[PDB]
Amino acid sequence: SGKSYPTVSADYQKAVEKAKKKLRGFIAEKRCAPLMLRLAWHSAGTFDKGTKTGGPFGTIKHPAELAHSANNGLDIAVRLLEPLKAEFPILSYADFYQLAGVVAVEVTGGPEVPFHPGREDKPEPPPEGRLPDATKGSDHLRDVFGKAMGLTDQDIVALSGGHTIGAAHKERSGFEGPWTSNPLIFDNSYFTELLSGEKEGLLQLPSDKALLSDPVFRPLVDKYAADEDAFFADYAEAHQKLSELGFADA
Numbered sequence: 001s002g003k004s005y006p007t008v009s010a011d012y013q014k015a016v017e018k019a020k021k022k023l024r025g026f027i028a029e030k031r032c033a034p035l036m037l038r039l040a041w042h043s044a045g046t047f048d049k050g051t052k053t054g055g056p057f058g059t060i061k062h063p064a065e066l067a068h069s070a071n072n073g074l075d076i077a078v079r080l081l082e083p084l085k086a087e088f089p090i091l092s093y094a095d096f097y098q099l100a101g102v103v104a105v106e107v108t109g110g111p112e113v114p115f116h117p118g119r120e121d122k123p124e125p126p127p128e129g130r131l132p133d134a135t136k137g138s139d140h141l142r143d144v145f146g147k148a149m150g151l152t153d154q155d156i157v158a159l160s161g162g163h164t165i166g167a168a169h170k171e172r173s174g175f176e177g178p179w180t181s182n183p184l185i186f187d188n189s190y191f192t193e194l195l196s197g198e199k200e201g202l203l204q205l206p207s208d209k210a211l212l213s214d215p216v217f218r219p220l221v222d223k224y225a226a227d228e229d230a231f232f233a234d235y236a237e238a239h240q241k242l243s244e245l246g247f248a249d250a
């Protein structure tokens with residue numbers, strides 16, 4: 001809604017389709033879907049609606065943005081994708097990284113998030129510090145996702161479900177371990193685990209726990225824990241919106 005997607009050439013479209021297939025095989029084989037989802041999300045999550053700066057515009061590959069503390073370990077993601085990207089010189093890094101994120105969700109069994117090409121690679125990384133802090137709560141989440149990015153409370157909860165794949169690493173954030181028993185499977189288990197309480201071997205961040213106590217977030221957690229179809233629907237909506245922040249006006 002509110003989007004006017006740019007025209008791209010037939011050759012650009014062909015490259016998107018071929019890159020999508022190549023990314024599926026590569027991501028599946030390398031077992032790096034969670035990292036690629038994090039790479040897409042950190043690329044997009046810096047958008048500030050009031051100034052129209054940051055967002056999914058290829059800047060995460062810049063040494064300067066990779067250096068941001070929130071981006072610990074994402075230099076691995078960038079390196080892993082570089083040989084593949086070089087096979088698709090016509091694609092923007094901006095598009096390529098968002099496409100990797102969409103593919104990461106698909107190959108782990110998640111919803112098919114619609115993808116529209118045309119993001120341009122912008123020269124200037126956003127300032128550091130826009131991404132959310134795992135030790136903070138619901139107010140902070142609204143500041144970051146709502147006031148800056150311009151996403152809804154529904155989007156916040158659905159997107160938090162992205163933690164249904166992958167893990168924290170004590171050498172990256174300092175937190176450690178997977179949120180779920182199946183960290184390469186995209187499903188609603190993140191909310192199931194969040195509701196059941198702490199379990200040995202499984203992670204919950206203070207930012208995850210903040211969803212349980214908020215009057216608006218909690219009914220959504222409950223909905224998603226009960227109804228994976230509803231989760232997949234709202235997830236696909238939120239991921240699309242996230243991937244298109246500042247793109248296509250909008």
Ligand code: HEM
Binds near residue numbers: 133
């Ligand atoms: C709600 C605010 C969020 C906070 C505070 C947060 C925080 C974190 C932290 C601390 C890690 C661990 C990094 C590491 O140590 O390796 C992590 C990993 C991850 N995040 Fe989030 N995150 C948030 C939202 C999101 C969103 C919106 C998505 C995507 C939709 C997402 C997807 C992921 C994935 C897939 C991983 C695992 C990466 C891997 O396995 O290497 N997160 N997040």
Ligand SMILES: N=NC(=O)c1ccncc1
Binds near residue numbers: 035
């Ligand atoms: N960050 N860990 C990974 O996902 C990974 C890193 C290097 N090669 C394959 C996978």
Ligand SMILES: N=NC(=O)c1ccncc1
Binds near residue numbers: 071131132172
């Ligand atoms: N808020 N947590 C993060 O996103 C993060 C912080 C430090 N290193 C990696 C990830």
Ligand code: NA
Binds near residue numbers: 180181187
């Ligand atoms: Na899972």
